[PDB]
């Protein structure tokens, strides 16, 4: 346990963004994909990347979501851009992102209760091939605390 220091800066985009978080995109062994900028809205989950078109999901869409001490992940359902997956990113700061997501999905007016955690079950086994395009879908999730967004019967 030690703390750091930044040896230089020379970007308009500061360490310390409330809002803005600098992200890497990871797939299943945890290898650096591609970089972007995530962007938190009182709307929806928004991502900044190159040319390539913006990425968001509406926070109705998130049926769970979690973060570790380096790395912050969430489960997208089929209403969405990039289809149903999981999708995780690597952050020094994914705490502040899970912290600022359950905020701003909470400010809509939504019923909410306390409730006991049940036993979640696996899947039988299945596999497949590259389909449609997108992020890195994990088949399984990274993250060792989930939380959970919307709920209705």
């Given at each position: 346990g030690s703390s750091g220091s930044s040896g230089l800066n020379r970007d308009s985009?500061?360490?310390?963004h409330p809002t803005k978080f600098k992200v890497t995109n990871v797939d299943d062994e945890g290898v650096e994909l591609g970089s972007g900028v995530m962007e938190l809205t009182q709307s929806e989950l928004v991502l900044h990347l190159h040319r390539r078109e913006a990425v968001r999901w509406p926070y109705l869409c998130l049926r769970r979501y979690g973060y570790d001490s380096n790395l912050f992940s969430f489960e997208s359902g089929?209403?969405?851009?990039?289809?149903?997956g999981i999708f995780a990113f690597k952050c020094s700061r994914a705490e502040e992102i899970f912290n600022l997501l359950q905020d701003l999905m909470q400010c809509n007016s939504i019923n909410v209760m306390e409730e006991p955690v049940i036993i979640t079950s696996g899947s039988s086994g299945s596999s497949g091939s590259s389909g449609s395009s997108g992020l890195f879908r994990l088949r399984?999730?990274?993250?060792?605390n989930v939380n959970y967004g919307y709920q209705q019967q």
């Open positions: 985009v500061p360490d310390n089929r209403r969405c851009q990039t289809g149903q399984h999730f990274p993250c060792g």
